């Protein structure tokens, strides 16, 4: 009847429990220790200025109403117990659209220690907004941020803290890289405060430093442009008594340059300035025209 005693413990634990009130509502500030494990770093959409990321989001706090004594020191409970207790309402400030996976069941986790400490872990995918500056494209680097914090709880009520040393609190899996066009140089974390129109909120920030790989653009744009420039200049060595041949050379080289210039931009967002690739294509077009 070990199940019976554990059921009795759980029933005594939720008796007279108001999940609408945070622990230490009027007499203490709730401190949520936070930890992120990145199981994969999804692709980066240059056109949409966003990036996908899969994580285990781990949150731990202390709830004094959930102290218990029994034959166990921890209670590994089914994830529907979390809906019966207070949990922090963390959200991602620069999140565009995220999903909390629930196949085949809600991908959630709740451990209660006998001293009242809780561990609450979720698996979720976040599409986050990463503003990009493409003046040095395709030789540019970016620091894509991930900002989260509490909705509706100001700094005076809920604060967030890294569970371990800040430099060790965001861990990226070894094989978890879905980056095709970029290279993940490392990650950085920080903590701060943002003043909103509803109060002062703690914000936890992570910065992922990404370096773009130039190879694709080399092969796809730079080599064709250099080749077209070489081909245009090859027309000089032809005899002057062959007007049709040199005319064909010039016109076809110009047409190829125009096609390449139209093609190159199609990969990038419609920014209002010229990138390094744009300058290279412009100079190649100038040489062909000359």
């Amino acid at each position: 009847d070990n199940t019976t005693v554990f059921t009795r413990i759980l029933d005594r634990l939720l008796d007279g429990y108001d999940n609408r009130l945070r622990p230490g509502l009027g007499e203490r500030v709730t401190e949520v220790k936070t930890d992120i494990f990145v199981t994969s770093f999804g692709p980066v959409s240059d056109h949409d200025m966003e990036y996908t990321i899969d994580v285990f989001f781990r949150q731990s706090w202390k709830d004094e109403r959930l102290k218990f004594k029994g034959p166990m020191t921890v209670l590994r409970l089914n994830n529907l117990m979390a809906s019966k207790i207070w949990t922090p309402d963390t959200f991602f400030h620069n999140g565009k659209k995220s999903v909390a996976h629930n196949m085949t069941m809600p991908n959630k986790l709740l451990r209660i220690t006998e001293d009242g400490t809780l561990l609450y872990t979720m698996r979720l995918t976040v599409r986050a907004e990463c503003p990009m500056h493409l003046e040095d494209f395709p030789m540019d680097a970016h620091a894509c941020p991930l900002k989260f914090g509490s909705y509706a709880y100001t700094r005076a009520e809920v604060v967030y803290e890294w569970t371990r040393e800040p430099a060790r609190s965001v861990v990226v899996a070894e094989d978890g890289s879905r980056l095709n066009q970029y290279d993940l140089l490392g990650q950085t974390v920080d903590s701060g405060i943002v003043q909103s129109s509803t109060g002062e909120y703690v914000v936890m920030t992570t910065h992922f430093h990404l370096k773009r790989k130039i190879g694709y653009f080399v092969i796809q744009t730079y080599l064709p442009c250099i080749m077209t420039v070489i081909l245009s200049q090859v027309s000089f060595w032809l005899n002057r008594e062959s007007v049709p041949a040199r005319t064909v050379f010039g016109v076809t080289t110009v047409l190829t340059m125009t096609t390449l210039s139209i093609s190159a931009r199609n990969s990038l967002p419609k920014v209002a300035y010229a990138t390094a690739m744009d300058w290279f294509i412009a100079v190649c077009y100038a040489f062909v025209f000359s």
Partner: antibody, heavy 116, light 105 residues
Framework: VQLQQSGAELVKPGASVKLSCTAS????????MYWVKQRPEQGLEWIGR????????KYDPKFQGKATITTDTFSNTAYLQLSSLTSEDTAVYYC???????????WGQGTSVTVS | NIVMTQSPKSMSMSVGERVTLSCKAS??????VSWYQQKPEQSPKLLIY???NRYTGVPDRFTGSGSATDFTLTIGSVQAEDLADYHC????????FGAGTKLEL
């Protein structure tokens, strides 16, 4: 709110010392406990760190092996076991508590350890 | 580790003047540097946590600033009880402390 350390003690070179740090007013399981070394007219030096709830420890690379840190959740105390003492181990050893963005808010009075 | 280069090594200033202590971080530490005041034969006392956050019971003249690698602690209108050592430490990684800064009159 209060961290009480053991009193000073004189030992001989090559001996072993086990310092004590008693926490009153809070549970050590709730935070990390730090041990810091201060030689005279010098800056502070982090010795190591322990997480009482898990028991795992981290040490400075220049103190690894020499020092051992342990706690006792029952008595709410932390220990620092120094081994193979040398003349340069004369200093004041502090016990500190992590809090509010890893700032080491509370410190012990310090123990003066000297080896003759 | 992360080396915290604290300057100047020492400094004297009369009572009523403004002083600025500076601390340099080797690598990036974000806003995870704290300032400690250690009076003679006493244990250190936390003054500033985060990077600009006065600990409870800290007078309003003390104030910190800085981010990334550069940090500073400006004591405006120092009094006679502000004579002590001032250590800067980073807690971004395993803690390291600056060599210290002695304040005389």
């Amino acid at each position: 709110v209060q961290l009480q350390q053991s009193g000073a003690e004189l030992v001989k070179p090559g001996a072993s010392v086990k310092l004590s740090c008693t926490a009153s007013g809070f549970n050590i399981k709730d935070t990390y406990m730090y041990w810091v070394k201060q030689r005279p007219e010098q800056g502070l030096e982090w010795i190591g760190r322990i997480d009482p709830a898990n028991g795992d420890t981290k040490y400075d690379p220049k103190f690894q092996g020499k020092a051992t840190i342990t706690t006792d959740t029952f008595s709410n105390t932390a220990y620092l076991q120094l081994s193979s003492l040398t003349s340069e181990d004369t200093a004041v050893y502090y016990c500190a508590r992590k809090g509010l963005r890893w700032a080491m808010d509370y410190w012990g009075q310090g123990t003066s350890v000297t080896v003759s | 580790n992360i080396v915290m280069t604290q300057s100047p090594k020492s400094m004297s200033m009369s009572v009523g003047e403004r002083v600025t202590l500076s601390c340099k971080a080797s690598e990036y530490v974000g806003t995870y540097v704290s300032w400690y005041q250690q009076k003679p034969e006493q244990s250190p006392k936390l003054l500033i946590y985060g990077a600009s956050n006065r600990y409870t019971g800290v007078p309003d003249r003390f104030t910190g600033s800085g981010s990334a690698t550069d940090f500073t602690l400006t004591i405006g209108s120092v009094q006679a009880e502000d004579l002590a050592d001032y250590h800067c430490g980073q807690s971004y990684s395993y803690p390291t402390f600056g060599a210290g800064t002695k304040l005389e009159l």
